[PDB]
Amino acid sequence: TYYLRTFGHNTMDAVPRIDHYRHTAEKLLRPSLAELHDELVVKFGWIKGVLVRCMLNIWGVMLFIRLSWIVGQAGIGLSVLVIMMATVVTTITGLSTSAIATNGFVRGGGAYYLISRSLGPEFGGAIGLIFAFANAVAVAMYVVGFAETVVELLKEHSILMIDEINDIRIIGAITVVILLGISVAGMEWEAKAQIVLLVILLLAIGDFVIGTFIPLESKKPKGFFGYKSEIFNENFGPDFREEETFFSVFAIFFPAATGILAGANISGDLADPQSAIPKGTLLAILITTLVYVGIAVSVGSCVVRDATGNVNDTIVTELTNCTSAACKLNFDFSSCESSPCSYGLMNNFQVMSMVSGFTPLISAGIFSATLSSALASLVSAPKIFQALCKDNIYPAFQMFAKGYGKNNEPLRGYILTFLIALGFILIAELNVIAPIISNFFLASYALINFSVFHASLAKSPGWRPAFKYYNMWISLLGAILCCIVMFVINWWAALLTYVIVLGLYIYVTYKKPDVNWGSSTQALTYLNALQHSIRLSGVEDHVKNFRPQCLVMTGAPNSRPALLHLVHDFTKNVGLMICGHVHMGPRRQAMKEMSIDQAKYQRWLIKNKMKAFYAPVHADDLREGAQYLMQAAGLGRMKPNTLVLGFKKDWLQADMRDVDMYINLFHDAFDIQYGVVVIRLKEGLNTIDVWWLFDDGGLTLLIPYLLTTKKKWKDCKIRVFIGGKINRIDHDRRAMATLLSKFRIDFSDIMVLGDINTKPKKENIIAFEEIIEPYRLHEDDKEQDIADKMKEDEPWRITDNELELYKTKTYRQIRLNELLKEHSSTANIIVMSLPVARKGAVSSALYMAWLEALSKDLPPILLVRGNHQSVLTFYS
Amino acid sequence: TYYLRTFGHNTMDAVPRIDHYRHTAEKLLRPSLAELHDELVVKFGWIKGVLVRCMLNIWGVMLFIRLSWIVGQAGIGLSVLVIMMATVVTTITGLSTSAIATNGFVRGGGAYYLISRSLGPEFGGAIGLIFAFANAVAVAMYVVGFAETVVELLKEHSILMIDEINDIRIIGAITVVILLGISVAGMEWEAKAQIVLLVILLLAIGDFVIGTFIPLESKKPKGFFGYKSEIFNENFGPDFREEETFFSVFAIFFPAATGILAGANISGDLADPQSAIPKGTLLAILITTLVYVGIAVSVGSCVVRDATGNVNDTIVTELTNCTSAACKLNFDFSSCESSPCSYGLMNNFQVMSMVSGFTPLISAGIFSATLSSALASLVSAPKIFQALCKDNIYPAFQMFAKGYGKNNEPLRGYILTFLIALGFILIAELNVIAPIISNFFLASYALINFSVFHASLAKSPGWRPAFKYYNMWISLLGAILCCIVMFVINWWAALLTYVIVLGLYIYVTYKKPDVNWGSSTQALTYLNALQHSIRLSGVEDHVKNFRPQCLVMTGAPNSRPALLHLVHDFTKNVGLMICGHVHMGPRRQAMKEMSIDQAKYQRWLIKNKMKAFYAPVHADDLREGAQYLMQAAGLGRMKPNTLVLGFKKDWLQADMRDVDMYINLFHDAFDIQYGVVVIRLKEGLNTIDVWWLFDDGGLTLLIPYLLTTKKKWKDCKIRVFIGGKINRIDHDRRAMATLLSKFRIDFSDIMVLGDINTKPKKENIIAFEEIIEPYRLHEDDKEQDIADKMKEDEPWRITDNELELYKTKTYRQIRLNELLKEHSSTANIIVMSLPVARKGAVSSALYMAWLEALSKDLPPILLVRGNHQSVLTFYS
Numbered sequence A, B: 001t002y003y004l005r006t007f008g009h010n011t012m013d014a015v016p017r018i019d020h021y022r023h024t025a026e027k028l029l030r031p032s033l034a035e036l037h038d039e040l041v042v043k044f045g046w047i048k049g050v051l052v053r054c055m056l057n058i059w060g061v062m063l064f065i066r067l068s069w070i071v072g073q074a075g076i077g078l079s080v081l082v083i084m085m086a087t088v089v090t091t092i093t094g095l096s097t098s099a100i101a102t103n104g105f106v107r108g109g110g111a112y113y114l115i116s117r118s119l120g121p122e123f124g125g126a127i128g129l130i131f132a133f134a135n136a137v138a139v140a141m142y143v144v145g146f147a148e149t150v151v152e153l154l155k156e157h158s159i160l161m162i163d164e165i166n167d168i169r170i171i172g173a174i175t176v177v178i179l180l181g182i183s184v185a186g187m188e189w190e191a192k193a194q195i196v197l198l199v200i201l202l203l204a205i206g207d208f209v210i211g212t213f214i215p216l217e218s219k220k221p222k223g224f225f226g227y228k229s230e231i232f233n234e235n236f237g238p239d240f241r242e243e244e245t246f247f248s249v250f251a252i253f254f255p256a257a258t259g260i261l262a263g264a265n266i267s268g269d270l271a272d273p274q275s276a277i278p279k280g281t282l283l284a285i286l287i288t289t290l291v292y293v294g295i296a297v298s299v300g301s302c303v304v305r306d307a308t309g310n311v312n313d314t315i316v317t318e319l320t321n322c323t324s325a326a327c328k329l330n331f332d333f334s335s336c337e338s339s340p341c342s343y344g345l346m347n348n349f350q351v352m353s354m355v356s357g358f359t360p361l362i363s364a365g366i367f368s369a370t371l372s373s374a375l376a377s378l379v380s381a382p383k384i385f386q387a388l389c390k391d392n393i394y395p396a397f398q399m400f401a402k403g404y405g406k407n408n409e410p411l412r413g414y415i416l417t418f419l420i421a422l423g424f425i426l427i428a429e430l431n432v433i434a435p436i437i438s439n440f441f442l443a444s445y446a447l448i449n450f451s452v453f454h455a456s457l458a459k460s461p462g463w464r465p466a467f468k469y470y471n472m473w474i475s476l477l478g479a480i481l482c483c484i485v486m487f488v489i490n491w492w493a494a495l496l497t498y499v500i501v502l503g504l505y506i507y508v509t510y511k512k513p514d515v516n517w518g519s520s521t522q523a524l525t526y527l528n529a530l531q532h533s534i535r536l537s538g539v540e541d542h543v544k545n546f547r548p549q550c551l552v553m554t555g556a557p558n559s560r561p562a563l564l565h566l567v568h569d570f571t572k573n574v575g576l577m578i579c580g581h582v583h584m585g586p587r588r589q590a591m592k593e594m595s596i597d598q599a600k601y602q603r604w605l606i607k608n609k610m611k612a613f614y615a616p617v618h619a620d621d622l623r624e625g626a627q628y629l630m631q632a633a634g635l636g637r638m639k640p641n642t643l644v645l646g647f648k649k650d651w652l653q654a655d656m657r658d659v660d661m662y663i664n665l666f667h668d669a670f671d672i673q674y675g676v677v678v679i680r681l682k683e684g685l686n687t688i689d690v691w692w693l694f695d696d697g698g699l700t701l702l703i704p705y706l707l708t709t710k711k712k713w714k715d716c717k718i719r720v721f722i723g724g725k726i727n728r729i730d731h732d733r734r735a736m737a738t739l740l741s742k743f744r745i746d747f748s749d750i751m752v753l754g755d756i757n758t759k760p761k762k763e764n765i766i767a768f769e770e771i772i773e774p775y776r777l778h779e780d781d782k783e784q785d786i787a788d789k790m791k792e793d794e795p796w797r798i799t800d801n802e803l804e805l806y807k808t809k810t811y812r813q814i815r816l817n818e819l820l821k822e823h824s825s826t827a828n829i830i831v832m833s834l835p836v837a838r839k840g841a842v843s844s845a846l847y848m849a850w851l852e853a854l855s856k857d858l859p860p861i862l863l864v865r866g867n868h869q870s871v872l873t874f875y876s
């Protein structure tokens, strides 16, 4: 029966499957909500790819040469502490790297890809460039270590080509060329070389361990004695026998702990990360740390610090106190504290190859240790560089993004890193440059830990690490410790690397590349905005804290640029600006139109440096869309309180439905207690005159003050016009002066006008009547059928009863325009009180004609009507 | 002739008057917008009340006693440097005080009133308590200085009552009693006493200056020589003949620079501030600094450092070189370096009373200098205390706010400060206390400067200070310098004062007093929220940055508390919660209802730790108000994307118009790309089962993950139910497991059901039909009048054609409820996919019955339908 078929076969709705969430690597092409609702070649495992590579990269030129010197200059306990501090740093860094790795599929590159996809392209580009350069230099430094041991073994025998430095450069160039050859040959060959070096190095470590368990009398003159408790108690203690300190020993040891990201830098060639990187990196760190601690302890409890290389030392046991621990085992290697004696645990770096068995085996271990790390860094650098260049963060380096072969191999990057390493090898004296490279590595580790902390601070639902044990405070502590260790090693190198990081960050944030990766920075932006708004929602309103929160019915924010600039003038950095656009038409097309317009106009607002919000709505007409915006726009206490309208210039030649809707917008704004600002200015193209004739709470006074508080209008002086009575001009002038001095509003002059409430000129009244003519109802000259006109061609038709009952207001508007023409004709901008027409008593056409008559033939003028709630105060 | 009357007489709209902005000190007030729209005893001047008080408070014990010691230890140049540094601190503090005091009317109080009204009651209360205590201690300090000079002048004669440390207390108690008496007498009496002390002190200064232009041979054995250029060139340079440094000298000098707020603590008795405090304080600071500099230079270029007072010191032109500025004038006061000589600039503090003429005049200058400052502190402390107590910030001190007499005089505070000063006088050894009091004053000054900087960083339109020359960077610099100077003297005193300020601030912010003064803190809250939202508006959306932005149709947010808590569970700290309320009725009453409910419900939300926004609207019905909210609610990119509704539990016993409106809310949400979440739980009042059978983009999966994120559901494990095919259970289960492992969604078990698509039980289908019957159209048994029935009692009437076209979907809902009953009966919460009914094809009643049949008789269940835009991702 079909009752037992595939669920979801008898419906259009699709069951969840991986094909709906897969970008490119289809099935059923998951149905849209409308369709359901609308009316009808080389891959490595974690062992060979991560564990082995990190293992080899960590173990370099120090495990077999300089570690004994460290256990000599500092005690066994102090050496263990030095090891454990860097181990803690690398362990926290590895935990953070794992947490970043288990968040999603990592395409290619290493630490760069993780950092850039975690917290964006600025830190990402900075750390990518710095880490790539650090690996390129580390190639030269490991090769220089190889050259040093080669020339040392040649000088031990009878062989020398040129001066020691020149021979070092000559051999190092050859080895770097050979390493470039192996790297170019491909990744499988690199892996084979890596595993053979791993087995040789493990054999060398076993050789050393077996050697320390078989003491011989030939090495008795040396420091070798074979795990004598006297040596243990003697070497346990900080004997710094030169211009050396604990911090300097830590600075010397720290480069050994690096290389933890060799496996993570291969992510572009791993079978799958999110399973390989975490366990491989953690196991590598654990094993390397255990080996370091064990070998340090063994060499400290088996070799004495000072030793004289002569069989002439005797064990006769003659009369001697010999409080030192050298004599307790025998008289060999004693009393070379007066003059510099040849060797021991403080003057010999070959002691590792001494206390062992087969010494050429230890030399081969040296070669393998220093060459595996160089190969790892030489592979690591171009992968990171190519991953960063594919993103085109720095357009100048686009050439190095190319790949070759079946597996994308950056041969240009290989050539570039080979050239950089070769250049740094010819110098061959890199002890000055080593702290800078260590600080670069530390900066990369610190920003990895900060990446985890920052992604955990922002609470993005898409953070979701698969790897547990990644506490955010532990990662923040790891970043802090990385910075501290960076400063401990060569303070000025740390300052310089901070300078480079900051400069690259600024350059990237100025270039502003067009990439969107869902970084933790954007999530943190959202979280900050939400938390700040929630905090603001609990703040009680107060009069001194009032701001003009303006909703402007600009439609497209491009139609009236000058108007939007003017509104921005008294809103930018003070209050809120919402650009309201109402879209009409069929719903399906209008939704797409709004989606396109939102992006386009928000981008235009950002590009033109406007601090405005775009608020598009869909409604059947302008009035109800404005109703939507005036009822619901905003969030919490950031809702608008003022409606800003551009003057309807074409109302004379337009359908009176449109002007009726304009005036109804006025009425609705007054209905829900909004202030209204009407702006009339010439869109084609020093005093600010404020005619404050009616008390609206002070909005018509507050707007021009905010105008003068900006640099654009800083040179314009506010002068005030108020209404008064003749023969009392000075009294009212002084009252106004004291009133706005209590408001601390700077003014240049106050003009009291007594010519208001006087009949305007005959020509002006004739012109107003001529303008009014085609909108009169003329009920006096008509029969009772005019009531039908009052319900069909209306309520915009102008009646005779209201034209006679409001003739005072009409004359006041005309006379006020005459006064504005006579006085404020040469003002930069005019702010004037906006008349309020009582709803249900004044037709739309009469209101619009009042505004036209009052505003005609004037410089930029603002008609303002406040909410009649107090907006100013003179109380503290 | 009425055309020339008062403007605004023939209209209802008023003209701007002072009475419209006056709290209590009439007229007809300002007419409301609705009315125009809706259809039918001691006061001081700045000279006496500020300038004199500040000059008297600044000049204390040091001006006439220890200034010479400072000029002796440090050089003339370093003395001028110390004076200028303290002057810079006090001048920036005075500019900041001026800027704060020229904003609004300052009722009473002093620096407390300014600080509290500028940046709120927390810092305000802290600094009020600290400054009041500091002035109370300073009373005892100045009284102790007066007692010390009295006892010194008594010991110069043969008079002595008891041991010096006890005679000091005996005299100091008497002087503090007399000071309390004169303070209690009244303001006018205190002013007269201050004026006479000012004239006596000016006479003493003139005495010193007149006596320095009169070199007498009787004072020649001492350091007095009378402006010899050798002394000028010799008294430069820092010769510290003790364990004293430059910083210690500065610490000794700084208490002389304080007292700059004496005229600002009298603000409650000034004729008018905003004009008295600025000019008076600045002029007082300038005058005091000029006098300090002149006195330092004069006494440095006139008196030598060391002087062995003896007539036997003569200069008979003996054979000697003596390359020092002692013999160049004469042999007097020469060679007292082997043993400490009796006096001079370094060993004498009475040198001021010696250089001058009449010496008792200088002693009276000492007395006036100490007593005027003590009186100023004793007056200022209770004024600040009673201003702080009138606000009830600390309700334990409410008894100290009451005043007696015509002018409100805090007599209780007077007794309190008298008792504190008397207690500190009995100790009589306050040199340990001194750094604490200096640090208290410095903290007060620093927070004044920070008040100006804060009010300038926030850009409140109501900041508007009347005093220019108040650059905010200079104020920030002054605050930083005040902190630095606080640290320079007695670092641990600075730590202690920071501890007290921090503790008082925490206590006040925990007590949360009910005041609202329009502080700069609230303005900065608004500015920060706006800036963060503007920054967020320029952030491109990404899939892994998606958050659930939910608009919940709660109505009153306390009607369904369990539903509100559940929505909060997956919204708190992640995404946005908007509580939508639709208000109906007449507009005039509904606006007032909305205004009341906004405050009430926002306060209720805050008081229950809910991070939700209240969004009330006025609309004709629920549907169009919800349309308002879905179209316009939110600011920028912080707009809702999901609609959350509670289940209509009473839909059976309700008018079908309401349920039709509910289902139309569903359809409208689906129309504009909104997810819908339906929640059905018992309002009366461990696994999370997710039955997500259709791919909505992942919202049905994302919500219960966010549920498990919270600590309330941290013990609940997500287990998943999907629809599959029999005999392919394991393959589908594995596919689901890998899909949600790529999503990093932790699950306990996956259950695949093949029993879906099978016919439900007979009893359940019978019950569904019985519930359905009352809303059936039954057109098969009727005539063409059913078409009219399908237009009036409609479109909620259920047709037979759709009941047959969607019988499979009905059976699926019933069967799914059976499966939920048998499987998820014990779950803590159930999340299930929400069926999508195609608009125009399924009646409202059929859709509601589908939901009811699906979710009936179950634990708390969520029906979720996502946007069908991708919400999860497995890409990094």
Ligand SMILES: CCCCNc1cc(C(=O)O)cc(S(N)(=O)=O)c1Oc1ccccc1
Pocket (backbone or CB within 6 Å): A057, A058, A059, A060, A061, A062, A063, A066, A138, A141, A142, A144, A145, A251, A252, A253, A255, A256, A257, A258, A373, A430, A431, A434, A437, A438, A441
């Ligand atoms: C940034 C680390 C890159 C390799 N450099 C580093 C590696 C190791 C090691 O153990 O991997 C040990 C040392 S060190 N302190 O010399 O013993 C190294 O410092 C060098 C090496 C050679 C030239 C100059 C500095």
Ligand SMILES: CCCCNc1cc(C(=O)O)cc(S(N)(=O)=O)c1Oc1ccccc1
Pocket (backbone or CB within 6 Å): B058, B059, B060, B061, B062, B063, B066, B138, B141, B142, B144, B145, B251, B252, B253, B255, B256, B257, B258, B373, B430, B431, B434, B437, B438, B441
């Ligand atoms: C916080 C300031 C309160 C007054 N105390 C202060 C005032 C003046 C002055 O000139 O007004 C000078 C000094 S001084 N020369 O440093 O001792 C004063 O320190 C004293 C005074 C007496 C007892 C202990 C400390």
Ligand SMILES: [Cl-]
Pocket (backbone or CB within 6 Å): A258, A259, A260, A261, A262
């Ligand atoms: Cl690394």
Ligand SMILES: [Cl-]
Pocket (backbone or CB within 6 Å): B258, B259, B260, B261, B262
């Ligand atoms: Cl003060």
Ligand SMILES: [K+]
Pocket (backbone or CB within 6 Å): A057, A058, A059, A060, A255, A256, A257, A258, A259, A373
């Ligand atoms: K290493």
Ligand SMILES: [K+]
Pocket (backbone or CB within 6 Å): B057, B058, B059, B060, B255, B256, B257, B258, B259, B373
């Ligand atoms: K003083």
Ligand code: NA
Pocket (backbone or CB within 6 Å): A056, A057, A058, A059, A060, A368, A369, A370, A371, A372, A373, A374
């Ligand atoms: Na290596």
Ligand code: NA
Pocket (backbone or CB within 6 Å): B056, B057, B058, B059, B060, B368, B369, B370, B371, B372, B373, B374
């Ligand atoms: Na004084």
